Request: fold
Amino acid sequence: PPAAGLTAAISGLHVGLVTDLEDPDGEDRIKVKIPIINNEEEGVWCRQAFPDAGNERGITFRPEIEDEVIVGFINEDPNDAVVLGMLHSSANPNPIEASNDNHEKGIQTRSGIKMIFNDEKSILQIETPTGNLVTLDDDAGSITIEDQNGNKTVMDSDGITMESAKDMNLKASGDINLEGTNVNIKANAEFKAEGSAGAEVSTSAVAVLKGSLVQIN
Amino acid sequence: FINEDPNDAVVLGMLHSSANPNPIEASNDNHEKGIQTRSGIKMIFNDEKSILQIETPTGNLVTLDDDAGSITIEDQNGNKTVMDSDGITMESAKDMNLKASGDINLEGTNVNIKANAEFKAEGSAGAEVSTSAVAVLKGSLVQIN
Amino acid sequence: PPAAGLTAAISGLHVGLVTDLEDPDGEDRIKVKIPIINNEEEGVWCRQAFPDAGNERGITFRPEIEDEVIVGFINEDPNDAVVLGMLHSSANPNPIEASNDNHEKGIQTRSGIKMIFNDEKSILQIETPTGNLVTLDDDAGSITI
Amino acid sequence: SSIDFSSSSSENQVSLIHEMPFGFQQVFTPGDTDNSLYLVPDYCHGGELYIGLENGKNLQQVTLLLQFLEGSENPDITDIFTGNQKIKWQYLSQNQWQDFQSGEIIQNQTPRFLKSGIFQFSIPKQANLDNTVLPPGYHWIKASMVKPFDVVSQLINIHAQAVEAVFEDQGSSGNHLEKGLPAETISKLQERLSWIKSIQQPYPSTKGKAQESDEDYYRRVSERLRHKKRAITLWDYEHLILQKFPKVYKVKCLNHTCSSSFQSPGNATLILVPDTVQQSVFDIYQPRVSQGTLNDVAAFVNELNSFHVQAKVINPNYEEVKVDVKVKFREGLDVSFYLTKVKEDIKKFLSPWAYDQESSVEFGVTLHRSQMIHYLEQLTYVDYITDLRLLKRQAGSSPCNPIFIETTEKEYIQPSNPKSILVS
Amino acid sequence: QSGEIIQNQTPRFLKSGIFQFSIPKQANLDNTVLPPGYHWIKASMVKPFD
Amino acid sequence: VLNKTKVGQLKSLYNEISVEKEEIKELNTPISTGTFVMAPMANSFDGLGEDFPKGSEKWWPFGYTKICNASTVLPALPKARLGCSISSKLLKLSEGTRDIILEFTFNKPILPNGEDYTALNKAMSIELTGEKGWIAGLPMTLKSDSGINSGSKKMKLSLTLDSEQPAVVPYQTELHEGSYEVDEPLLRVLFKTNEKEGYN
Reply:
């Protein structure tokens, strides 16, 4: 007989609502109401299934209070309920618009942090609510890192560009070595260079020193 | 079980218990979500503070933090890059090499170069130091050609 | 009586095929054929379960047209079907080769964008189809962009 | 630089800020003029209590429970809110204190902070969360008094969202009625509703009464047949009160006592001692009767005395001596029957006279022979060579020169009134 | 203090038994004479070691 | 009707006056003239957060001014903090010997008995915003030319800083630990309410 003959059994799958995420006996259960039984009281403690779980590992997301979930029952016993997944509806819209092309996939949290995969354009974009983002874009052939304060680094077909909103500090405990075909240094106010053990400017062709006044020692 | 046949079984999901604890502590506030693997590699989403952090077991990490207004990239060897309200800072544990197949162009209001031992600059087709105001060359000894 | 005595009931879980992802009445349903009933017509609208969902949030992936899925039924009524997950088979191979060591895990999309977690070597690698990549490698002690 | 604070058309380039006990205020900004500035905030004579509220809204109602320890006030003050005087209430807006309007206070059951009760009000429009004289983020409400600090009772706590409820008499046995329902017995509704996270019960229930037993029925009828409901002699007064007022533990009638005399004809004083069994609330070493009971008792009896006589009803104003003794010759163990445990038992035996508790001994105010018997009865004792219990002449806290009880008294009370001989 | 030791069945370390006590208020985890992170309790004797 | 409004904080003050202001002829009166105290946490044991001992939880809604009462002995409450501050550009001082003079004028005469600089140093305490935090202690003692003349409407104050002292700088919330909307340096003066001179 159903549910071992010890209780009335409940067949099929049912829909419930989440009322409490803190399990008094440490089994990682969540409390869920089932409206076809009673939609006013607190509900019962259910076990939750995850896509990945083990001893101190796994992928963990939990429903918010009043989220709608789908519930199964072990051996059709009403008090061996298991949460199998979360549902969407017009009262709780899906953030990614449906299409038969199925180009957009990803993760979006409560606070607005996104991670989106665009197949049509081969683009991966990670972004927070106030402008901090990292983008990998094969339709541009580039990588962009940008913050909310106006600082930006870009790697693309024209080489590597870095810009700072305020200042820039390059430091090393060892040597600093710059190379290139043409090295051009400009300042809108002052230029200085120092060395505690000497300094040198040299070339195989012509050295030039100019100013409105040139002083030597 | 498909059609309630004992030999058409399907696995629907994995379970936690006190014998196999959930790595993220339960709370009715539900602020912390994420992925944690067997070896300790994490990817965690903090809603309260709007923080996304990716981190491996021996200190290699990338953090996006809206409660700081910054982006940090840091490795296990002490190398670090930070973008924040004070601009862009880079530090190296040992050395730093900047190279290009083309030109290197530096700009700013004030450019300050310091070395604790030596400073050198070269150009195979010449070199130039100039200014509209005053050029200065000093040392305990100055040699020209 | 089964399915409230109003219709023939359907017991156990069944396998179906996806034919249409655009729901005419806005409930986020998908249309699925069930071959043990009829493998030629269009099918019926089913609700989809997700690992995370709520008001303007969640983890969303949808099956492609002609993907194979596992379907449950509310109160054993044939027209209250719910999609619980997607299946693999030799006709639709799993991109990550099986092993009892279970070292490799991750995400791979239709266009070839990958995100792979290697436990053996503690490596996280994010990569697109034409060479744009970011790698965090504890077996090298380095970060590469 | 030189600044005339009253002059227009002058570069008064200075900023002035006042420092206050819990914050600050900007007074004068650069470019301003004024006619009356001071270097300091003005605090007038009196006392102030500030209550900060979290998460309200500018048009919602707030219900507050003020739980007092009733009777804990100073009985020897002559300025006591006579006539229609009461405690004043105000709210904070833009760093100013403002009076509440007539439609903003719904009820005030505690106008002079002497009894527990409800306060209920709506949050006024223009209530402000962003202020500097008091920390921002809270709505702030002020209560004030200009009287000495002890004319009001001490508090236990203040709670928001209080609701009153009552026992339903059905066909069962109301055993909890003699001593009321203990603190924290109630945690749930009959139908647990989904929206209620929770319910708390901090204090014991009160005002109930069980049906009369046969023993009480006979006791009550028998006394009326003797005293005829008149308050004439000693027995009459003492038994009329214990029958009428159920939460009085002991009573004492004083035949010629006035506050300044123990020989004045035409008067009387009555002393009331409460039970205070629910020590979760009460101070069991200073049990006191609240004004409600002191006044109700006086009214009840004065109607039954005589046209010519009014009685006064007071608290005992307890004072007492305490024991010291030779070490016990035996104990169960140094810990199990520690001298501290013996001290606790001694305190309980005495406390039972001061306040309700169990005690085998007839009275605390007794000879050492009674004390010896009480200890001899213990299962963890054998003997003690000597004991004494003089009054604490060496009590520094209550001023020195205090009377001692050394002259071979059987723990006699220091006085007819303003004494108890029940230290514990 | 007198209320902090509940029982001592082993007063002279000659027989097996139970010692029971409460952790006192003002017990301190942050010290330097003994490693931090632990509450520390001391027992002592002035007699030969055996 | 139930909602989420909660009681968050409880604070209290008390000002007790024994002597009518008209009898203050000098700051160092032979008799106390009044007492002012505060409790930052009104419902704690000492007014500052100490837990009530197990046996009883009781507190006075408007504080207290005496230690020994009808039955017990309580810890004293801290005395009220009262004062003011001045902010202006002339305080931007970075080096050398610095001498700062302040003069104050009122509508009415101050007292029948004028006051020595040693009287003022028992009544007040002055601090400045500097490079490493607040400048305080011995360097901020009033000098000998300060004081109040007997029939005058003017009070004079005098401070000096050694060449070895930190610079005086504009106020910074991250350095001087506060919340003032001031873009200049601050000079802060508090009254020593613990003393008769400060209170007077």
Observations:
- The two ends of chain F are 50 Å apart (CA to CA).
